[PDB]
Design an enzyme around this catalytic site. Structure first.
Site, PDB file in Angstrom:
ATOM      1  N   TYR A  11       0.476  -0.970  -0.102  1.00  7.01           N
ATOM      2  CA  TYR A  11      -0.389   0.301   0.182  1.00  7.01           C
ATOM      3  C   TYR A  11       0.921   1.437  -0.164  1.00  7.01           C
ATOM      4  O   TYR A  11       1.844   1.185   0.812  1.00  7.01           O
ATOM      5  CB  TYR A  11      -0.984   0.125   1.199  1.00  7.01           C
ATOM      6  CG  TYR A  11      -0.553  -0.096   2.431  1.00  7.01           C
ATOM      7  CD1 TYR A  11       0.738  -0.708   3.319  1.00  7.01           C
ATOM      8  CD2 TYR A  11       0.116   1.805   2.840  1.00  7.01           C
ATOM      9  CE1 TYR A  11       0.735  -0.398   4.854  1.00  7.01           C
ATOM     10  CE2 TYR A  11       0.512   1.982   4.261  1.00  7.01           C
ATOM     11  CZ  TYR A  11       1.304   0.529   5.154  1.00  7.01           C
ATOM     12  OH  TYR A  11       1.463   1.541   5.981  1.00  7.01           O
ATOM     13  N   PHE A  27       2.045   9.816   3.542  1.00  4.19           N
ATOM     14  CA  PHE A  27       1.871   9.771   4.563  1.00  4.19           C
ATOM     15  C   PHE A  27       2.008   8.712   5.104  1.00  4.19           C
ATOM     16  O   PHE A  27       2.819   8.649   6.369  1.00  4.19           O
ATOM     17  CB  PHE A  27       0.837  10.500   5.331  1.00  4.19           C
ATOM     18  CG  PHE A  27      -0.403   9.475   4.580  1.00  4.19           C
ATOM     19  CD1 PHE A  27      -0.805   8.635   5.817  1.00  4.19           C
ATOM     20  CD2 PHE A  27      -1.361   9.920   3.517  1.00  4.19           C
ATOM     21  CE1 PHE A  27      -1.527   7.733   5.380  1.00  4.19           C
ATOM     22  CE2 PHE A  27      -2.531   9.187   3.516  1.00  4.19           C
ATOM     23  CZ  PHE A  27      -2.452   8.126   4.199  1.00  4.19           C
ATOM     24  N   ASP A  28       2.404   7.703   4.904  1.00  9.71           N
ATOM     25  CA  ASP A  28       3.010   5.923   4.988  1.00  9.71           C
ATOM     26  C   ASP A  28       2.811   5.190   3.615  1.00  9.71           C
ATOM     27  O   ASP A  28       2.332   5.616   2.949  1.00  9.71           O
ATOM     28  CB  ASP A  28       1.396   5.966   5.316  1.00  9.71           C
ATOM     29  CG  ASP A  28       2.052   4.070   6.631  1.00  9.71           C
ATOM     30  OD1 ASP A  28       3.586   4.371   6.798  1.00  9.71           O
ATOM     31  OD2 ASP A  28       1.347   3.455   6.599  1.00  9.71           O
ATOM     32  N   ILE A  76      -8.611   1.446   9.356  1.00  9.86           N
ATOM     33  CA  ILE A  76      -9.332   1.864   8.950  1.00  9.86           C
ATOM     34  C   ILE A  76     -11.106   2.056   7.968  1.00  9.86           C
ATOM     35  O   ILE A  76     -10.608   0.848   7.582  1.00  9.86           O
ATOM     36  CB  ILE A  76      -9.121   3.211   8.739  1.00  9.86           C
ATOM     37  CG1 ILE A  76      -8.292   2.973   7.099  1.00  9.86           C
ATOM     38  CG2 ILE A  76      -8.114   4.598   9.076  1.00  9.86           C
ATOM     39  CD1 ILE A  76      -8.076   4.377   6.441  1.00  9.86           C
ATOM     40  N   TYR A  93      -9.828   8.966   9.830  1.00  9.34           N
ATOM     41  CA  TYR A  93      -9.380   9.531  10.833  1.00  9.34           C
ATOM     42  C   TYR A  93     -10.590  10.298  11.147  1.00  9.34           C
ATOM     43  O   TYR A  93     -10.777  11.037  12.449  1.00  9.34           O
ATOM     44  CB  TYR A  93      -8.276  10.263  10.893  1.00  9.34           C
ATOM     45  CG  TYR A  93      -6.869   8.844  10.736  1.00  9.34           C
ATOM     46  CD1 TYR A  93      -6.788   7.360  11.969  1.00  9.34           C
ATOM     47  CD2 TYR A  93      -6.410   8.066   9.547  1.00  9.34           C
ATOM     48  CE1 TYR A  93      -6.663   6.783  11.780  1.00  9.34           C
ATOM     49  CE2 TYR A  93      -5.851   7.528   9.299  1.00  9.34           C
ATOM     50  CZ  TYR A  93      -5.397   6.236  10.123  1.00  9.34           C
ATOM     51  OH  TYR A  93      -5.056   5.063  10.081  1.00  9.34           O
ATOM     52  N   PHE A 107      -5.161   5.559  -1.666  1.00  4.21           N
ATOM     53  CA  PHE A 107      -4.768   4.576  -1.066  1.00  4.21           C
ATOM     54  C   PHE A 107      -3.770   3.518  -2.936  1.00  4.21           C
ATOM     55  O   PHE A 107      -5.064   3.524  -2.913  1.00  4.21           O
ATOM     56  CB  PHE A 107      -4.726   3.436  -0.536  1.00  4.21           C
ATOM     57  CG  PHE A 107      -4.446   3.933   1.274  1.00  4.21           C
ATOM     58  CD1 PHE A 107      -3.599   3.676   1.941  1.00  4.21           C
ATOM     59  CD2 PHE A 107      -5.889   4.434   1.967  1.00  4.21           C
ATOM     60  CE1 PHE A 107      -3.824   4.045   3.237  1.00  4.21           C
ATOM     61  CE2 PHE A 107      -5.852   4.934   3.068  1.00  4.21           C
ATOM     62  CZ  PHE A 107      -4.159   5.075   3.526  1.00  4.21           C
TER      63      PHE A 107
END
Length: 120
Positions: A28, A38-39, A58, A95, A112
């Site tokens: 991912y 961000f990740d 999530i 979030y 994503f």
């Protein structure tokens, strides 16, 4: 019911689908709508494994990877093993209005790139 937006980029086997309670392994890449990352699983150096459908991640992920817990939805394509997809997750399936500052701000939509590498 708020649904995530799912775009199939490369079809998988169309036979192997995760159900709630299953474990999955995925590659991912997580970005904001401005393109800032961000990740990602590359950052971890290993693909990410989790149980789907149990609020371990999530909601947008749970919903996407379990096809809305088995009951499907409008414009909600299934993700089979080997599927490369883009998941656009609205704040409330992510979030939320609080977010998790400073990692992710309030009311953020998450985009994503994911690939489903394995199911169990």
């Amino acid at each position: 019911e708020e649904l995530p937006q799912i775009e199939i980029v490369q079809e998988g086997d169309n036979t192997t689908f995760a159900k709630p309670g299953d474990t999955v392994t995925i590659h991912y890449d997580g970005k904001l709508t401005n393109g800032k990352e961000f990740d990602s699983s590359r950052k971890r150096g290993k693909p990410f494994t989790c149980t789907v459908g149990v609020g371990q991640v999530i909601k947008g992920w749970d919903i996407s990877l379990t096809n809305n817990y088995g009951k499907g939805g409008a414009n909600l394509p299934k993700i089979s093993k080997g599927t490369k997809a883009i998941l656009t997750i609205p704040p409330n399936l992510a979030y939320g209005p609080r977010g998790i500052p400073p990692i992710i701000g309030p009311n953020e939509t998450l985009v994503f790139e994911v690939e489903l590498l394995g199911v169990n």
